[PDB]
Design a protein around this ligand. Structure first.
Ligand code: ATP
Ligand code: ATP
Ligand code: PRP
Ligand code: PRP
Ligand code: MG
Ligand code: MG
Lengths: 376, 208, 376, 209, 376, 376
């Protein structure tokens, strides 16, 4: 038996996963993204550079026998893209995509998978919100090509808004941490109390109470905040992305400027795509805030449950009928089988009379000197 | 033996130093090539010479088996010997460490395989160009390695280029210039300074 | 920056690798092989069950935090197929294929990769040599579909010959080990010496000295060996497979009955496919074990150097021309771009006027209200 | 790629003593390698070509398939530890012997012995197979000098006549093993190019016996 | 057999080592130094904090199974004393001593030991040169108690002199490195050349050419250097330590202000004790340059060759004579043996007639109803 | 800060540990045991030769850079004594003692130490039970010299009894393993069940149920067992050692013939010394192997909690009084301080007026030109 949260992907799921991975990778490549396939193992130096404590906990460690240095089995591919871009990207714009297995020490959600298949895309070297709009378009054409019944809802945030208020208010680390934890618990009454005794305290309350209404957020803030150039751009970026998502993709977008995980890890815009009612986001993406970078990734394995393929045609050649054939009639049959295989039929040349494929749907039988498919 | 023990290598290094040793009053009594002895007296009864392979010279001088010696800077770089004093550039056995591939061949678009004697130098060189490589250790006849698939480039000394060109190769990058240095054992520099200083100043003159 | 024997597969190589892996996997699936995608990590119990000391050395170890048990990062997928077949295979014939990354502690050969992409196929539950002939045919149609200039040379062996001689000679473990190490070095003079003081010693010498000549091998052996039923069948199986390979696939086959790595795991026939003059075989396969089993695997990454794709068509939309369009004309362009992408053109919507893809072949330009491709 | 065979030889002793065997096999060299800076040469047979290497490189070249076959001393093969080549023939040329040697009439110091040697693996394996515990320093040549200047108690080196030992004030002590040049073949080349090899190997087989 | 540079310390050497370790540890303890015995293994974080690349190369690495973190087997105990002082030392003065095995990956000198026994003493929290004078006194009373024939010569340096000149001259990292490497090679002619084109270049020449003469060094330096407070103190500290060493301990001291290993690792005063003509210093010590710290350490194993004990009295009781005794006479003998053992005689009660201690010097024999020692 | 099961031994504990280690080592040396100090690291070949899987798990592994071979950091010194005896011991009787740090990967028990200080003694080349009696006497005179209040209880076992029954019953490896695991859990009900279906099964039950009563054990066994010469001697040896322990040392001894950890390494008699009620034995020893060998070892660090020293006399010289002295009066004081230190007083020469040792008991003060100790 296998460990908990460690599973085989078998049979049609394995097929489905291979098809998703391949189609989704081709779509990215056709949108101008350079495919990269970095290795499962690296030195921890580059692998966990700027990692959250959550990430380094999920990363397994192993010793390089050649150098006695600490390597790790990747829990996230994104750092490897940074490394790759630093050596091959140049100063201009660079687009990358990837799909690969990553390994986690603990399952990330209840009955989760320790071995998810991470697939993502990243744009480097572009300041503009245009880069973010492009990635949204690629993501959504990918998602729509899957013809799912399940629906993706997008939460947008932007850590720059709160971060700018906190520097303008001149808050301590103590204050910043208490606010973030009040925000994370939606504790509106205790936020009200704390905000009475804090510089620009009404702005911090306004984010929690009125941050969802991004159209009017700027008008609700203090004159001090309203004059700050970075707050104004951040609110504008959210409006543009929300608008684009709603118009172009008919996507229901919510805004939460109090979403502040990644406050410490250099995020600007944050993006979380949620499938139906599942707590774990299916898609996570955002800006880095000196080389520009923005991108996303998703768990391809989690798409399996919400995507469906046409049932396969599994064909068995009749053993006895085949072994009665002369050499010429076998060459004609193999030509016909080769034709079936090129159309994606799964055809078995039986080794014995008992040789029986799993999930047999058709038999290739002989009647009136004609080989024909007949369903079982 | 309480005098000085000079460490030299057999062909090129022995021959080109003979002028400087003569001016310093340390001429060889017999021809080392006409003998299987590896230790020889000189005209000066304080000095004696050791005949080594060029790669051994820093090792002998480092651990005090020779008080001083003449080694190529290429060997000193590869050896990485922080435990000797490198006093003089003698400006003899001049050549240059560099890379070399096949004539007109393009670089394969992947990790480069370097065939070289100079393993540490190769890695250090390519790393300073921000690049990673894979290395095979070889001991000589390096110019043959790219012809028979054993590496993309080589790292080797080249003077005229005749050996590169004769084996269908051409030089690519320049790593550094190389000439023989006079190296001295750190304890010997302290304890036998009186014996050394005249001999060093004769070399110092012979160069200038 | 990366460890020794650990490399990124980047850009066109990454594309090429994705295409090879996918085509090769589809060919297997269409030949009736069930795709399986087992996890990177398992408990060592099932992962290294019946492992050679070579395999367990190459396998990294890690602790399952949930059970404090030893897991490993797979060095070989083949044991996982055994496990899967034991639970899903039944008593009849079963066919499996797989493709996945495996991790090795040390590089296997000169300039070797610690992170190869292992791809393979296996047939369970068939005694007949017909199963081996089938796998040879699948492998060779796969190889021929790659249209390589490099050539595959096949070495066949059969551990049953030596194994039978060793039990008939009643050799000790000491003797068996010394012979195997002499065989691995083809140390013919020292083998001659050792064989003078061993039971049936001339047979053990004959294997090394004359094992290449499979036609005459039986006639060169002792009467004791010649009467042994298992030796006779093993030599016959080699002759049949060599013949099949030469007739059907026009393949130069060599024989080495002294090839005995996998002595403990290979029940019978062994197969090593060599690309050009490279020391490491590109393909390894053979018979193993009371359930019958035979199969192969290869390093997909090593095919990269010997395969080439049609150069990609890389299209850049004109930045200025696009930004002058009204909303309706953009929707018409995106429809046309979507069309190009479905035909496998790689089209970039430029973020700025300077946005220039790597390897640009065409530009999608505007003239007389018509967007057209022109080569650069 | 080269369709025929690439023979790996070392310059000096190995080149000279093999010329007889190569002649009988119809593989004589066209020009003198010492009168040239080229390290790769044609032969009378258009399928065979020769590589001129340092003796220590020969197993490496043959091992990785840069040469299909070659002639290397057993001492070098022992030190190299190459399990990835086929050692087919004892050619019975370049005969000498690996052994230990100290200073003439010196007693063994009563402590851990320091061994100066090129043959590092052989030295350790040898002394371990006796009662002996040692420390080894790697050196590359002129081994007979090491005990004279305090760099080791004993050495491990090849000796034939003993002239080099005696000329540097040393004498032999223990006998490790006999050493002669072997014909080594690349494992893949033995499989793929057997037709090209078998005649040439049997000519060598005759030349010896 | 054992690895190279890894040895048993056996028999009298083992005894001698135990005696040295114990006497030297007692002397330190009686001089007011607190004994500490930190563990062989720690996390690399604290173990190699501020380590030279040389130190981390010599340190073996291993994984903590409980945390998957990198530990190391200590190559140096000094960092552990820092850690200990940080948690237990307080702000006042603190004195520590230690003796323990350390493990190196490579032998540190030719035919060296990978497993030396490091013994040292450190004073924390004292700015004064008085702390350095105290450590010199402890070291030298320890050394003199060993009654060696070999002589210790002391080299003093002080990296503050060069470091101050380099900041005052406003040298680049390029210049500093070239000077240090010229100094390390005693390249006086090329130093002269370089110094003509460097700010305060004649000061850098003066260090090399006249640094040995510490009495006159200040008077030879530029007015710029002579006014700098830190240069003046550094030269004064060297004069005081040199004087103290010569007067109090009759020790020949050399000065080398161009000794600059430890330029990067925060040294002020540096101390190297050399035994006879051996390249590796027997004793290394110095200042740290915000908690004050100064101390030394030595390889106790290297003292073995230069220290000698009185040969041991190894006694064997006569087997037959003992077994003829009545119970009362045995109790009287054991009382006498107990007495011998309390005087440090090594006495063996033989199990059989053949029981023979190694290195037997005396026999405890019976004659005229008197047990007496008689030499063999 | 330090790993789990890794602690500093600091200050008075470090002093106490140094004193214990030294006294205990001297006692052994005076009893005719040869001190040996083998290295922390060796090749795994000799280090783990004949190791239990428990031992090899506790042993860390590292690569020798000079040979690319596997070394280990010793978890047990005992194998190293075997090695040493094989090269230096001869065929006669040989006695060895040792004290040294060993490193374990996991803590051995609750609040256990990964870095214990192992101290032991071994006798080689004596068949007689007299060798075991000697080691018991040395151990117990060592233990009694520590003047502890805590009490040592001895468990005796003997693996020969079970081993003989298992060969006579012709048990499989399956049976032997199940019995041993039932014995280790003293699962008497399930042992009863298993023993009904085993050859000589009632004997195996009797060992568990009645093995404590060594006087009557032989009379409770089958006639098959009662006639076996090796079982009879083993039971007799236990009776003799139990008697010796009770008469000579007034020690309460329990017997457990089902104690079979070290089944593979213990040839015969086993010994476990328990301090008070602690699960881990403080002392482990027994017979092993064709060269006879028996010995013990203990964790010196675990004695710390149950041993106490006379409080140290800590002296502080008066700072002001000392600094008013002329040079001649300082030399007279240092002579007097040197005298105090030779008597084991711990004397501090203060660096400043505030310099205050920890645990100050006396001050060396000046009055009427006389330096005298007065208590604080
Ligand atoms: N072609 C050359 N021209 C000038 N100097 C050279 C040339 N080749 C080598 N040297 C210098 O001479 C030194 C000694 O070279 P030498 O010919 O003695 O040995 P090698 O060919 O480098 O190798 P080996 O010591 O194995 O024979 C080298 O370290 C280098 O500094
Ligand atoms: N004196 C000798 N007589 C006979 N055979 C020898 C003698 N010395 C060495 N050999 C053998 O001949 C082989 C080649 O000799 P060669 O002169 O090329 O080697 P070398 O000079 O000892 O070393 P290198 O070629 O690496 O400088 C050696 O590997 C050894 O097996
Ligand atoms: O650039 P060039 O002037 O041709 O010289 C370069 C050659 O010299 C070096 O050694 P050496 O001269 O000793 O040749 P060897 O090592 O082959 O004896 C090295 O082996 C180069 O092949
Ligand atoms: O016992 P002997 O007959 O003296 O032979 C032994 C010597 O031969 C070899 O040298 P080689 O002949 O290759 O010359 P080299 O050492 O100058 O390369 C070897 O390096 C020994 O020094
Ligand atoms: Mg040369
Ligand atoms: Mg030679």
């Amino acid at each position: 038996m296998l460990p908990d949260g460690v599973a085989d992907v078998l049979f049609e799921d394995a097929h489905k996963q291979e098809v998703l991975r391949h189609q989704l990778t081709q779509q990215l490549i056709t949108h101008g993204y350079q495919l990269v396939s970095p290795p499962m193992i690296e030195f921890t130096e580059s692998l966990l550079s700027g990692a959250s404590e959550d990430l380094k906990r999920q990363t397994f460690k192993i010793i390089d026998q050649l150098t006695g240095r600490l390597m790790g089995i990747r829990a996230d591919i994104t750092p490897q893209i940074l490394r790759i871009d630093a050596h091959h990207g140049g100063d201009g714009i660079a687009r990358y995509c990837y799909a690969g297995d990553v390994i986690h020490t603990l399952p990330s959600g209840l009955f989760g998978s320790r071995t998810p298949l991470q697939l993502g895309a990243e744009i480097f070297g572009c300041e503009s919100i245009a880069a973010d709009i492009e990635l949204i378009d690629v993501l959504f054409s990918m998602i729509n090509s899957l013809d799912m019944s399940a629906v993706l809802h997008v939460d947008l945030g932007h850590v720059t808004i709160f971060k700018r208020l906190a520097e303008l208010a001149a808050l301590s680390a103590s204050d910043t941490e208490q606010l973030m934890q009040l925000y994370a618990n939606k504790n509106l009454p205790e936020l009200k109390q704390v905000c009475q005794v804090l510089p620009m305290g009404s702005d911090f309350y306004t984010l929690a109470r009125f941050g969802h209404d991004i159209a009017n957020l700027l008008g609700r803030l203090s004159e001090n905040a309203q004059q700050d150039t970075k707050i104004v751009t951040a609110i504008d970026e959210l409006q543009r992305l929300k608008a684009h998502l709603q118009v172009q993709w008919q996507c229901a977008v919510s805004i939460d400027v109090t979403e502040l995980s990644g406050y410490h890890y250099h995020t600007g815009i944050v993006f979380n795509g949620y499938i139906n009612s599942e707590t774990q986001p299916l898609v996570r993406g955002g800006r880095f805030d000196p080389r520009q970078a923005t991108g996303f990734s998703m768990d391809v394995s989690r798409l399996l449950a919400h995507t469906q393929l046409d049932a396969p045609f599994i064909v068995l050649i009749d053993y006895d009928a085949f072994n009665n054939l002369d050499s010429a009639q076998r060459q004609l049959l193999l030509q016909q089988v080769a034709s079936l295989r090129q159309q994606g039929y799964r055809v078995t040349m039986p080794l014995t009379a008992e040789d029986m494929p799993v999930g047999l749907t058709h038999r290739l039988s002989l009647a009136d000197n004609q080989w024909r498919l007949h369903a079982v | 033996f309480l005098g000085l023990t000079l460490a030299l290598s057999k062909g090129r290094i022995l021959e080109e130093t003979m002028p400087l040793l003569r001016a310093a009053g340390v001429e060889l009594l017999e021809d080392p090539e006409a003998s299987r002895k590896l230790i020889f007296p000189t005209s000066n009864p304080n000095v004696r010479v050791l005949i080594l392979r060029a790669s051994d010279v820093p090792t002998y001088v480092e651990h005090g088996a020779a008080d001083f010696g003449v080694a190529g800077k290429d060997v000193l770089l590869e050896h990485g010997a922080n435990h000797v004093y490198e006093l003089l550039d003698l400006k003899i056995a001049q050549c240059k460490l560099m890379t070399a591939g096949v004539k007109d061949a393009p670089l394969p678009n992947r990790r480069l395989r370097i065939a070289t004697k100079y393993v540490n130098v190769a890695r250090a060189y390519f790393a300073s160009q921000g690049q990673q490589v894979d290395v095979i250790k070889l001991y000589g006849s390096m110019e043959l390695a790219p012809l028979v698939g054993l590496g993309d480039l080589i790292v080797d000394v080249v003077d005229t280029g005749n050996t590169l060109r004769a084996n269908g190769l051409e030089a690519r990058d320049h790593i550094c210039d190389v000439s023989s240095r006079l190296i001295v054992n750190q304890v010997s520099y302290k304890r036998k300074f009186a014996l050394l200083e005249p001999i060093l100043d004769s070399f110092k003159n012979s160069i200038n």
